[PDB]
RNA sequence: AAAAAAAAAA
């Protein structure tokens, strides 16, 4: 009961993580997007109690299409509460492979001391965190969520020059939004929202991450 | 912030909010005995004179449209086209 | 003038007509009052029609009608049967004529005596007009009530619907020009109310020691009282003019 | 002058008017002002204001005047309409049996000041010259007006029968070329509904012509009502004795049925439905039985009424009343409900001491078995007092929070401003919308459009839209020889038609992507079918004669139309992307309706008709744009706060079919206004 | 015994109360699909109506649709889905409330409101806690509610009111930059041609 | 004169509108103002439950006479047959009870209360009695014969809860009604001739 | 008036400094007497000063030499002997008092902190949110930690002559501040030096001295501009006196027998100040001075806000509460909503409406008396000179 | 002449 449900939720979480990596412009193959539950059972195992697969066994490294040295790690700790010891273990793994992006998927909780740790290690390495309950549902696949596109700084400058817009008088989106966490949006970026309009067909808006 | 004439991105069609104030201001100017640009056909209410000289677009009013970035575009009466 | 029935049929007199210019029956009967049939089904007053039928029956017969509720001795069919014997239509309908032309009305009409009550809301006690009159000793606004000759209340939703129309000049007229206009002299450096003697044409700011840089601002009087009240609350609404 | 009634709930509750001096000491105005002002002439005190500057008088003339404010931007519908006995005599005057003499139409002639002093030839010429009601309503309608609707008493089986264009009942309402031809008018055709005669005469002729048409109706109709007359009486409230016996037998059968329901519930034979308890199941069964009996008796009462019954004609005129009013007049009142429920046991298991304890019969429940004509028992009269107090309570209680919500909504969007670049900004200049309503158009000049490229099958799409030149028989009977010579001289026409078909396929795919539930009704300006009909009628288009319009000229005209109908200007990629994003539904409707098959086999448009059509489409799409300098935030707040005063009408006649906790009405919008911090009735639809 | 009688849960969600099973009878909660002929077919699938909203324990179930299931709790949509989904959900709830009584309001007036709702990136309310917390002027905020508190906050913080709103210019009495007052009229000296 | 029902200095804590100017417009308006009943609930409550016309107001208050506005359901008018209780001393009913058969509370065991029927006089528990039907019939006879108990005194026999409640206080409202035994009225044609 | 009529562009709010209050006032030496009438003539330095404004319809202003319509009214000042709290600013004042030190009047977190800089660049142009973030940062600070020699944890470390200055901490614990109305109490959960006791009451003078010694740079990070809104100006030391336009002389019959509530409240203020300055000059006991300060603060607070809960209501002569300036502004019938939002128009009429079917919709039937009463102000043109001539 | 209270109409 626990093994089958754990394997099912691990496969669903891995599929959600792979779709998140595909949505962020990273080098993602089609078979990992279309990995079935039986494919996950054959590749990794079906009994998570006896380490088949282990929580550290499933570790995902993905690369970017344009810049191959820009890569992301995905970490699955087994413990419910995350201390600074395992964060420092991931960090000591993280400098020795010369990569600036990783996401740790917590299970139960992750301490405010480690919150402050992730705050003050931020402008060298990006170490995002995610809850296991939030990664059982793809956010962008919902019918209430329109299309979100991350936009570069040159197109942002073109948007500011075309409409005579300033950044403080733009439409805003909080940095703690689940959509912004899904795309990994930082403060100062502008996301483009394409939605269906019943009076014009489709509409495009621009939101500032704050 | 003087926008050049070829740089004007505002509409070329004069809407009714401009029409009401230009008609009122021009009829008030005629009501203080301004020269009338067109021929008079016995009309005594200067608002009617304001319409019948707005038809030939001979009203010396420059509209200063204000863009949200505190820039202004100057549009003349004859550059704008009557619509109702 | 406001009239009403005994069944909630309130209304006002739209117009008056002389006897030669309105409808008359075959017996030359000009009614005292005419009403709208469209007020009948929406208000759901069948008892008004039963009152009219019983009034016609009691006025032809010569008896005082009984209108006691929950009485099985009074029925619509019984009143109709008794009214049929007096040479009239059993539903109380009558054939009338045009007043202006004299032609017969194609649709037969229902006539009879009812009981109507006048109301105290006369137009003579409610008409009010005002061009210019007294102003308040505090805010210089018009009075309240017809007895004090006060103007109308340009309320919040008037400003709401005029903003919805988006005509700024009517707002500037009704809320600045015809309510409480005032002129104040303001120091440019301090932005507060400065001393202005109009006789010798002198201007002086008591704090900025300013004699030349004094400007004139037109404003509502209530805004001036708001600014003075804020100046009493250790608040400086500095209105610079440059 | 400015004419205003308090309370002002919306934009239309204060107009501009022209002073006419009358001796008496009251305010005098037209009857059609009663609908936007919500006036009732029952002691309504009302205000007038005088502009003290003549530029403000010019602003009153150009903005605040009544005919320029005919169509609301709230729901793209008229706010004034033909009402009361004027509408009743419009309904009674368009009837087929109304044969009207030379003298009476002569009397009606001088009350048309827009008449051209050209009297029509009579419908009947021998032996006596007689006109008809449609012939004299034809003189009232100006310009080119073409219109299709139906009467409120139109049977649904008539449309698929052989009599769909020739009605024995005179129900389908047809207007062609600005003269009334067919049908009896009602609330649907001459009321505040969208697509009415008033809406299209505003949209096709202008503000002043429609406003004169409003006044030209009412004087002629009220002068004809002097000849005809209209009257309700106590005889209109009494039906046939056979109908009365049938109604009493149906009421007795319903009482026997609910007694049997009570007996089987007491005998442990009532199985509870899922989703509710046995109490709710029993109450729902009793309420359904009583409501079905009331509706059946009301239908039997309405069907048995004759055409001479003025109450039925007044109800089907649509000026006032409904079918439940007729049912309460004739058959029965029904079940009295407090908060949509049973009359509560105020005493110990008794609603009244005159009943018995633990009685659930319809006498003690609150059901009224007698009509108001027959009279009520004192117990059911007390139950009607129970029912009638709740309406006054619901009117009195919620209107404080309704006005508070309206003031809060009008304070929050008091400066949401459309600027000169087409964008939407607040007082601080923060960008809210790039275009107003995401298309940059005003809400007054938009209407309802049927979308033909959504619902239909793929084979219907192939046989209905794909233009084929191989069928030479249709090609010969449809096109003239000059078009054949012109297109055979060219060579790019076949691939041009193939590209048109590909664009139609792509537009159908995009429309199916946008609308997943197959909604074929959109809100768009510039109704294409009406102006195609107008240029058919103006240029006298023969639909059984070959035309001289080549499809290549049609495609060139459509492309020039879509290039010249811009909203977002600029040659930039962002500007072009916003241009086809704002006009995507308009482009889809233009390509779907101005296809090469509709204008050649179906509508058979000519060349000069086509250029007049593209000029009219360009002009009407230009004038339907959102005006730079228009407040939209306070307009939106008032257009949403106006229905907040009208969601108390559906309080009665409620039983509930589902036992789900849900908040409806004022509270719902109140919470969405507080960002629904805590849902009043938290529910998931899974 | 009281602990295992009144507190523990055998199955389900503690935040969810009564749950109903039903089939929709209208073409609004049915599944609309496209057939092979190109027609739209509405399939009346079985569906759930639960009292109490917690879709972290509902959408993450074994056989629950992750796409079409929504909620009426706007704040929970904000902490689950996002601010544009909040805009769409507020528009859908307003449409449901207006269509319950049959009243029709145009989409542009609702969309302007719903884009005002999502202006700052979070849920601002039309109250004294969402309007008075904006970046607007002092006379924007004091003229609605809590006049004295907003005025003393502006006095203490030396807040500059730039006179861009409409009620500001209504208070100080000149022509507002609003409607037909959002521009200036200039006399053309060269256009003064021959007159009388 | 002012209407504030209390001290002049502390009139802010006093009720307003107890004393009103008499409406001398018609005779019917004067009669309606002389028979007016005012609810103490203020006219700003969003709760509809005090504003609902109750089922217990049959023949007590007028069902179809309330002012319009925010004061609907609170201001009401008396019925045509209704009569307000003046108030009377509850003494001789108590002496008649204690001399007839009734057993006082201070002279009984606490374990002998469940079988008997309690007697409440103006909300005060006095004792118990084991034959409530015969006692209530005797009380009805003594109230009808106008001997000791006046007709103003209200009395309830809670059969399902074994209680007897006697109310003699002011503020009660009553309707005079005919008396029916054995399916027949007590009013005869001899009473019509009288 | 030969003054340039220009349009104002923006409104700058602020706090009137007591030097500015003394500079605005035309009452030289301050208002000293509570008596309005002195032998049939106005008294200088009183509540009916001719320098403040005019009296009746025949009098002229002593300052600007105008009538009611010409004189806008001129303010006065009262020099209080001891400073008192402004009650409405109290909800702001603790927000500074919980962020600044109780002893050395310095900031609880040093202004070169990166979190402070991130708040400053984050909240540019938003001073209220800046103060909110500062108060959220300083909610957990209980000790005035500082000292340049408090980081000597290294051994054999050479001192750095290019070292930045460190934080200045007087080594004192900041007390918790409690309030039950106008009284302010401070409690130390951790004991300071033995000369300071654990529970103290803090008057307005201690808060005035604390907020006086705060530099402008610490006020800038506090989101509160020192040019117009210094924090020491919130404590009332010089009370402004409104002119006769704000407080009109209510005339009963011929002569003004009674004044309004504001004049009586200012008379109570003058009497309170005179009693306090008489008691402190006489060398009276400490409880008498404390009672005088308490009643002066009570009169000042009831002049400002009479709607404060937990604060004794001001007693008027007619059994009513006093109507303060907050009651004049806040409310539906207030000076904002009932006098600026909804001020009454002049040219208007109102009557009962009746139907008229033959009129078109763009016309209204107007009664003759209303049309005679209401006037249209038409300009005179040569086109219609004869018609307006025959009209006049 | 202010303020408070009461009665109402829409
Ligand atoms: Zn100065
Ligand atoms: Zn002066
Ligand atoms: Zn310190």
From TrEMBL, chain A:
Record domain RNA polymerase subunit H/Rpb5 C-terminal: where: 137-209
UniProt cross-references to InterPro entries, sorted A to Z: Arch_Rpo5/euc_Rpb5 (IPR014381), RNA_pol_Rpb5_N (IPR005571), RNA_pol_Rpb5_N_sf (IPR036710), RNA_pol_subH/Rpb5_C (IPR000783), RNA_pol_subH/Rpb5_CS (IPR020608), RPB5-like_sf (IPR035913)
Any single GO CC term annotated in Swiss-Prot or TrEMBL for this entry: RNA polymerase II, core complex
Record keywords, A-Z: DNA-directed RNA polymerase, Nucleus, Transcription
UniProt keyword tRNA processing, yes or no: no
Location in the cell: Nucleus
Pfam families from the UniProt entry: RNA_pol_Rpb5_C, RNA_pol_Rpb5_N
GO MF, any single term: DNA binding
Positions of the RNA polymerase Rpb5 N-terminal domain: 4-94
Metal-binding found in the keyword field: no
GO biological process, one term: transcription elongation by RNA polymerase I
Quaternary structure and interacting proteins, as annotated: Component of the RNA polymerase I (Pol I), RNA polymerase II (Pol II) and RNA polymerase III (Pol III) complexes consisting of at least 13, 12 and 17 subunits, respectively. In RNA Pol II, this subunit is present in 2-fold molar excess over the other subunits.
HAMAP family to which the protein is assigned, alphabetical: RNApol_Rpo5_RPB5
Function: DNA-dependent RNA polymerase catalyzes the transcription of DNA into RNA using the four ribonucleoside triphosphates as substrates. Common component of RNA polymerases I, II and III which synthesize ribosomal RNA precursors, mRNA precursors and many functional non-coding RNAs, and small RNAs, such as 5S rRNA and tRNAs, respectively. Pol II is the central component of the basal RNA polymerase II transcription machinery. Pols are composed of mobile elements that move relative to each other.
Family, as annotated: Belongs to the archaeal Rpo5/eukaryotic RPB5 RNA polymerase subunit family.
Name of the featured protein: DNA-directed RNA polymerases I, II, and III subunit RPABC1
Gene behind the chain: Polr2E
């Amino acid at each position: 009961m626990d093994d089958e449900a754990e394997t099912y939720k691990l496969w669903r979480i891995r599929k959600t993580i792979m779709q998140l990596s595909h949505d962020r412009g990273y080098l993602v193959t089609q078979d990992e997007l279309d990995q079935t539950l039986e494919q996950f059972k054959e590749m990794f195992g079906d009994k998570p109690s006896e380490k088949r697969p282990a929580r550290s066994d499933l570790i995902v490294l993905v690369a970017h299409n344009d810049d191959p040295t820009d890569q992301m790690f995905v970490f699955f700790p087994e413990e419910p509460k995350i201390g600074i010891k395992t964060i420092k273990t991931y960090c000591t793994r993280m400098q020795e492979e010369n990569i600036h992006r990783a996401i740790v998927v917590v299970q139960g909780g992750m301490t405010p001391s480690a919150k402050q740790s992730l705050v003050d290690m931020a402008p060298k390495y990006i170490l995002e965190q995610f809850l296991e309950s939030e990664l059982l549902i793809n956010i962008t696949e919902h019918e209430l969520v329109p299309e979100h596109v991350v936009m570069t700084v040159e197109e942002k400058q073109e948007l500011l020059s075309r409409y005579k817009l300033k950044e403080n008088m733009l439409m805003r989106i909080q940095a703690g939004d689940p959509v912004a966490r899904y795309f990994g949006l930082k403060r100062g970026q502008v996301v483009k929202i394409i939605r269906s309009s019943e009076t014009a067909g489709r509409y495009i808006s621009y939101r500032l991450v704050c | 912030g003087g926008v050049p004439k070829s740089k004007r991105i505002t509409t070329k069609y004069m809407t009714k909010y401009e029409r009401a104030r230009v008609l009122g201001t021009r009829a008030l100017q005629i009501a203080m005995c301004a020269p009338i640009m067109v021929e008079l056909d016995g009309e005594t209410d200067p608002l009617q004179i304001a319409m019948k000289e707005l038809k030939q677009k001979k009203i010396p009013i420059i509209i200063r449209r204000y863009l949200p970035d505190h820039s202004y575009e100057d549009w003349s009466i004859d550059e704008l086209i009557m619509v109702d | 003038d406001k009239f009403a029935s005994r069944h909630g049929q309130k209304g006002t007199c739209g117009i008056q007509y002389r006897q030669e210019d309105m409808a008359f029956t075959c017996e030359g009967l000009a009614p005292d009052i005419i009403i709208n049939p469209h007020a009948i089904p929406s208000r759901m007053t069948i008892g008004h029609l039963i009152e009219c039928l019983q009034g016609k029956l009691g006025s032809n017969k010569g008896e005082i009608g009984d209108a006691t509720p929950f009485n099985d001795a009074v029925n619509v069919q019984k009143i109709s049967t008794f009214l049929q014997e007096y040479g009239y239509h059993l539903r109380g309908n009558e054939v009338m004529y045009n007043g202006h032309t004299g032609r017969k009305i194609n649709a037969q009409v229902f006539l009879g005596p009812t009981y109507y009550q006048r109301l105290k809301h006369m137009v003579d006690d409610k008409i009010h007009s005002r061009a210019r009159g007294p102003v308040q000793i505090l805010v210089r606004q018009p009075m309240e009530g017809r007895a004090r000759d006060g103007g109308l209340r340009f309320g919040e939703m008037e400003r709401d619907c005029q903003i919805s129309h988006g005509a700024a000049q009517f707002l500037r007229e009704r809320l600045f020009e015809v309510s409480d206009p005032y002129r104040v002299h303001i120091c440019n450096f301090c932005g507060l109310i400065a001393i202005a003697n109009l006789r010798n044409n002198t201007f002086e700011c008591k704090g900025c020691k300013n004699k030349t840089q004094i400007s004139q601002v037109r404003l509502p009087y209530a805004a001036k009282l708001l600014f003075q009240e804020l100046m009493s609350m250790n608040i400086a609404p500095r209105l610079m003019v440059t | 002058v400015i004419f205003n009634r308090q309370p002002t709930l919306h934009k239309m509750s204060m107009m501009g008017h022209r002073v006419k001096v009358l001796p008496w000491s009251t305010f005098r105005m037209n009857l059609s002002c009663t609908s936007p002002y919500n006036a009732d002439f029952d002691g309504d005190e009302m205000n007038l204001h005088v502009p003290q500057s003549m530029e403000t008088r010019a602003e009153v003339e150009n903005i605040h005047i009544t005919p320029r404010q005919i169509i609301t931007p709230q729901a793209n519908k008229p706010v004034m309409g033909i009402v009361q006995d004027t509408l009743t005599a419009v309904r009674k005057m368009t009837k087929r049996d109304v044969f009207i003499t030379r003298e009476q139409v002569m009397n009606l002639l001088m009350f048309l000041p827009t008449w051209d002093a050209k009297m029509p030839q009579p419908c009947i010429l021998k032996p006596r010259p007689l006109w008809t009601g449609k012939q004299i309503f034809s003189l009232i309608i100006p310009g080119n007006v073409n219109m299709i609707r139906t009467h409120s008493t139109h049977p649904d089986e008539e449309d698929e029968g052989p009599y769909k264009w020739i009605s024995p009942g005179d129900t389908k309402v047809m207007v062609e070329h600005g003269e009334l031809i067919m049908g009896i008018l009602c609330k649907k055709s001459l009321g505040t509904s969208a697509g009415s005669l008033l809406h299209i005469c505003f949209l096709e002729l202008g503000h002043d012509i429609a406003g004169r048409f409003y006044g030209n109706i009412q004087t002629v109709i009220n002068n004809w009502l002097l000849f005809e007359g209209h009257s309700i009486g106590i005889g209109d409230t009494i039906a046939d004795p056979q109908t009365y016996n049938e109604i009493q037998q149906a009421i007795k059968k319903a009482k026997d049925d609910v007694i049997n329901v009570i007996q089987k519930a007491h005998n442990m034979e009532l199985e509870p439905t899922p989703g509710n308890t046995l109490r709710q199941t029993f109450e729902n069964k009793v309420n359904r039985i009583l409501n079905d009996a009331r509706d059946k008796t009301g239908g039997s009462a309405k069907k048995s009424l004759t055409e001479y019954n003025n109450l039925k004609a007044m109800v089907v005129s649509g000026s006032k009343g409904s079918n439940i009013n007729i049912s309460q007049v004739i058959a029965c009142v029904g079940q009295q409900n407090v908060e949509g429920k049973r009359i509560p046991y105020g005493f110990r298991k008794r609603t009244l001491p005159h009943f018995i304890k633990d009685d659930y019969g319809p006498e003690s429940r609150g059901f009224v078995e007698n009509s108001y004509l027959a009279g009520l028992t004192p117990s059911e009269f007390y139950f009607h007092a129970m029912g009638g107090r709740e309406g006054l309570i619901d009117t009195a209680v919620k209107t404080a929070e309704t006005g508070y919500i309206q003031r809060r909504l009008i304070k929050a969007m008091e400066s949401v401003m459309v600027n000169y670049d087409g964008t939407v900004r607040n007082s601080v200049g923060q960008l809210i919308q790039l275009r107003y309503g995401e298309d940059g158009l005003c809400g007054e000049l938009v209407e309802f459009q049927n979308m033909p490229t959504v619902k239909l099958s793929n084979k219907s799409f192939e046989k209905r839209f794909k233009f084929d030149w191989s069928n030479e028989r249709l090609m010969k009977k449809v096109f003239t020889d000059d078009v054949i010579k012109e297109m055979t001289d060219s060579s790019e026409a076949i691939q041009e038609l193939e590209a048109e078909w590909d664009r139609l396929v792509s537009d159908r795919d995009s429309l199916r992507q946008i609308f997943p539930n197959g909604e074929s009704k959109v809100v768009l300006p510039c109704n294409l079918q009406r102006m195609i009909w107008n240029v058919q009628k103006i240029f006298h288009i023969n639909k059984r004669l070959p035309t001289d319009l080549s499809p290549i000229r049609v495609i060139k005209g459509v492309k020039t139309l879509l290039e010249r109908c811009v909203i977002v200007t600029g040659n930039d990629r962002i500007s072009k992307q916003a241009n086809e994003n704002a006009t995507l539904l308009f482009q889809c409707l233009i390509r779907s309706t101005l296809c090469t098959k509709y204008v050649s086999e179906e509508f058979r448009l000519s060349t000069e008709a086509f250029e007049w059509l593209v000029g009219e489409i360009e002009t009407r799409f230009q004038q339907a744009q959102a005006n730079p300098g228009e407040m939209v935030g306070a307009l939106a707040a008032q257009s949403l706060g106006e229905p907040a005063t009208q969601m108390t009408l559906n309080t009665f006649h409620f039983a509930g079919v589902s036992s789900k906790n849900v908040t409806l009405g004022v509270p719902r919008l109140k919470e969405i206004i507080n960002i629904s911090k805590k849902p009043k009735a938290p529910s998931l639809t899974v | 015994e009281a602990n295992m009688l009144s507190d523990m849960t055998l199955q389900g969600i503690e935040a969810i109360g009564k749950v109903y099973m039903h089939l929709p009878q209208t073409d609004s909660k049915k599944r609309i699909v496209i057939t092979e002929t190109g027609e739209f077919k509405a399939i009346g699938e079985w569906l759930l109506e639960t009292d109490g909203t917690s879709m972290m324990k509902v959408l993450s179930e074994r056989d629950v649709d992750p796409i079409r299931t929504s909620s009426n709790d706007i704040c929970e949509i904000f902490q689950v889905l996002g601010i544009e989904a909040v805009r769409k959900s507020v528009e859908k709830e307003m449409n449901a409330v207006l269509q319950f009584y049959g009243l029709y309001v145009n989409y542009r007036h609702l969309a302007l409101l719903c884009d005002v709702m999502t202006a700052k990136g979070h849920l601002m309310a039309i109250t004294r806690h969402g309007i008075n917390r904006q970046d607007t002027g002092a006379l924007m905020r004091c003229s609605f509610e809590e006049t004295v508190d907003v005025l003393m906050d502006a006095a203490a913080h030396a807040e500059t009111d730039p006179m861009r709103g409409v009620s500001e210019n209504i208070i100080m009495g000149q022509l507002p930059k609003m409607g037909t007052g959002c521009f200036d009229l200039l006399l053309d000296a060269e256009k003064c041609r021959f007159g009388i | 004169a002012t209407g504030n029902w209390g001290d002049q200095k502390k009139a802010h804590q006093a009720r307003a509108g107890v004393s009103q100017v008499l409406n001398r417009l018609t005779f019917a308006s004067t009669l309606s103002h002389l028979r007016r009943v005012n609810s103490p609930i203020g006219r700003d409550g969003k709760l509809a439950k005090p504003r609902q016309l109750h089922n217990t107001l049959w023949g007590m208050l007028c069902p179809a006479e309330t002012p319009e506005g925010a004061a609907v359901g609170l201001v009401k008018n008396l019925a045509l047959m209704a009569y307000i209780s003046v108030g009377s001393q509850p003494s001789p009913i108590l002496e008649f009870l204690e001399e007839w058969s009734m057993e006082n509370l201070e002279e009984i065991a606490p374990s002998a209360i469940a079988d008997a029927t309690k007697i409440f006089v103006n909300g005060c528990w006095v004792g118990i009695h084991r034959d409530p039907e015969q006692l209530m019939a005797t009380l009805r006879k003594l109230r009808r014969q106008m001997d000791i108990i006046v007709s103003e005194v209200s009395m309830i026999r809670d059969i399902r809860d074994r209680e007897i409640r006697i109310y003699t206080d002011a503020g009660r409202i009553c309707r005079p009604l005919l008396i029916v035994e054995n399916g027949s009225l007590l009013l005869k044609k001899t009473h019509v001739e009288m | 008036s030969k003054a340039p009529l220009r349009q104002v562009k923006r409104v700058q709010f602020g706090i009137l400094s007591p030097d500015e209050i003394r500079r605005m006032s035309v009452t030289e030496g301050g208002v000293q007497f509570a008596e309005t009438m002195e032998g049939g003539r106005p008294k200088l330095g009183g509540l009916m000063d001719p320098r403040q404004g005019v009296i009746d319809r025949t009098s002229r202003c002593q300052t600007c030499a105008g009538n009611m319509t010409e004189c806008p009214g001129h303010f006065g000042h009262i020099d209080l002997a001891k400073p008192v709290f402004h009650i409405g600013f109290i909800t702001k004042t603790i927000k500074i008092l919980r962020c600044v030190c109780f002893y050395c009047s310095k900031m609880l977190v040093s202004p070169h902190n990166p979190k402070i800089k991130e708040i400053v660049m984050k909240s540019r142009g938003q001073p209220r949110k800046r103060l909110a973030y500062v108060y959220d940062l300083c909610k957990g600070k209980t000790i005035c930690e500082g000292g340049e020699d408090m980081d000597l944890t290294k051994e054999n470390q050479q001192p750095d002559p290019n070292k930045k200055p460190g934080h200045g901490g007087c080594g004192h614990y900041q007390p918790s501040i409690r309030r039950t109305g106008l009284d302010l109490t401070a409690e130390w959960k951790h004991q300071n030096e033995d000369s300071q006791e654990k529970k103290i009451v803090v008057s307005a003078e201690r808060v005035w001295e604390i907020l006086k010694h705060i530099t402008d740079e610490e006020c800038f990070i506090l989101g509160m501009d020192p040019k117009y809104a210094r924090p020491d100006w919130m404590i009332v030391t010089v009370l402004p006196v409104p002119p006769l336009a704000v407080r009109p002389a209510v005339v009963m019959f011929g002569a003004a027998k009674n004044q309004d509530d504001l004049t009586h409240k200012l008379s109570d203020i003058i009497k309170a100040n005179n009693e306090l300055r008489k008691n402190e000059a006489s060398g009276a006991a400490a409880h008498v001075i404390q009672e005088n300060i308490k009643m002066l603060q009570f009169h000042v607070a009831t002049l400002v806000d009479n709607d404060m809960p937990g604060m004794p209501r001001a007693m008027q002569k007619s059994g009513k509460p006093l109507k303060a300036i907050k009651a004049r502004l806040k409310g539906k019938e207030g000076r904002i909503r009932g006098n600026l939002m909804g001020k009454r128009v002049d040219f208007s009429a109102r009557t009962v409406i009746t139907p008229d079917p033959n009129l078109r919709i763009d016309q209204v039937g107007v009664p003759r008396s209303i049309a005679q009463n209401l006037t249209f102000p038409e300009l005179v043109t040569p086109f219609n000179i004869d018609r307006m001539q025959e009209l006049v």
